Amino acid sequence: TGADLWLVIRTMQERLGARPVVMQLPIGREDTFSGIIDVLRMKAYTYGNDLGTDIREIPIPEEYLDQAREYHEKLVEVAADFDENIMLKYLEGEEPTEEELVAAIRKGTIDLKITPVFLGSALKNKGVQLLLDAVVDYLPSPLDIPPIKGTTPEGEVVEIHPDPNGPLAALAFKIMADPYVGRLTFIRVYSGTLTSGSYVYNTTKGRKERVARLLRMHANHREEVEELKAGDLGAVVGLKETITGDTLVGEDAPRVILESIEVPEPVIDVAIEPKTKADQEKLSQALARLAEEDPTFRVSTHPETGQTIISGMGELHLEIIVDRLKREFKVDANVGKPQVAYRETITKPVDVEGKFIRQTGGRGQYGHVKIKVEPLPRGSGFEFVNAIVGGVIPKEYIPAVQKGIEEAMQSGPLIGFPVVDIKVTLYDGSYHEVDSSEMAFKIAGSMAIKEAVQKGDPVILEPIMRVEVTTPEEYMGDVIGDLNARRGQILGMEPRGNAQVIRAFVPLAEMFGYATDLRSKTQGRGSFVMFFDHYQEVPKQVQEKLIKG
């Protein structure tokens, strides 16, 4: 129930903009099915049963006929946006020769113009042979597929011909496992003949390759072939290096390369922390055969926190990845939430006394540093001034007293992380010929900085990303809702074409795995891009709640 025509049709030019000319019409809506009519060749192939053991093709049962007839007319009428014969023929009211249909229609079909809607039902084997015939009639041969793009062994354009005498030049795709013929590469050549038992050579990372046996997955059993032709398709054994998307020419064959540069860009970011880091490198071997059988994902550690991160382009994707892990790799890794790099700063001018009045066994290393410290905008940078009130602190502390300002600014006072985006300054000090080393005033700077940042108005500058919601208006309003509900704030709404994209502030702590969320609120109308901006405060209470140990 729900099996229809106008449904699908409407949906086509209402969800993309196609041109759904169809060529077959049903005999009985839901349960009441018995076969199809064909406004193409003007015939009514009808299947008198589900299994399809005894089918037929009698004319219209009485009520249809005229119905499909107008659509037949439509067919020829639409064919007026192509040649010259058909158009003028409908003008004449002349009958289309049964094969100019095959013409003008396969014309538009392969020309990406018309939408040869053939249809049917699977379980009740109906509406089948009509579309197999429709394959053998309207589905494009490699003769009609235009010059395939690519690069040279030098650097320009390419012309990959269907030529079964042309230079061996191929592509390959899938990396199959196998017991007997092991590593199996599923390939579609392009231009160039290849022998069973000869050689080849990878035209990517360069590797002379032995071709063992060309093969064709013939439905049930697999069929071993003598050769692969220029344009034909098949899978080969050997190629003990060939990965995926590799361009493969022969041993010679002007070492040409294929264009095809696709992208499995990151959209998911889930963390993973195995129990003890012994299981970890072990699972780096797990990944060693995970990242080497399935490209896609990116296994990138974070810098400002340990724990390798699993990034990728799919929710359930990453998840059944994790399943395969807890299946044939058995790892104990309490799948963690992604951590955050937290910088920090202040908002006040504090004057302090970095006085190191300490005369050890004579050498001291005493350093009285009088600094003024000033704070400025989050995004500015690090400042300091060559500020001597008159001529106090030696010119050998100048690039090394401020070190202890920098040095003691990798470890913040709170939970302790790099305190950034601040000015600083200085102003005075005290100096003594022997009783003072470079590092003495470096550490005077350490003391100075610690007191002047502990007592200086603490804060935490957690990072915040910009994000481009790529989606239409409906779910746009919806997601603007969500994003407000994600602690941050938006700030961008430029009306695009088939979409309307929203530039959005969202707080990196929040916005965790937002695709999973997004991929729902819009059902599926695209997504966004990770466009990181800058950092700002966590609204008071989130700062102290995080004060742990």
């Binding site: 919806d478 729902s520 609120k521 059902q523």
Partner: protein, 83 residues
């Protein structure tokens, strides 16, 4: 909504056909399957059976789908609002 002989065999969201039977004092009558008609000769026991079928398969279920007198459906967010 079908009507065979005396009984009405409507088929709603339920996994089985709904089988009602016009009792003493009133008559139903199903013109087309998309809308049942009820000639009720008893204003009291009438709306009781209207409500019988309405409450047999209640409509509006968040988005839509069900049995409406004609009372304009109040919506609520469909594939959403369940975190």
């Amino acid at each position: 909504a079908r009507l065979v002989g005396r009984a009405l065999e409507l088929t709603v969201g339920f996994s089985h056909p709904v089988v009602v039977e016009p009792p003493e004092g009133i008559t139903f009558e199903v013109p087309e399957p998309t809308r049942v008609r009820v000639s009720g000769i008893d204003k009291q026991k009438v709306g009781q059976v209207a409500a019988n079928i309405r409450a047999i398969r209640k409509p509006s279920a968040y988005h839509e789908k069900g049995i409406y007198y004609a009372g304009e459906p109040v919506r609520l967010k469909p594939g959403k609002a369940g975190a």
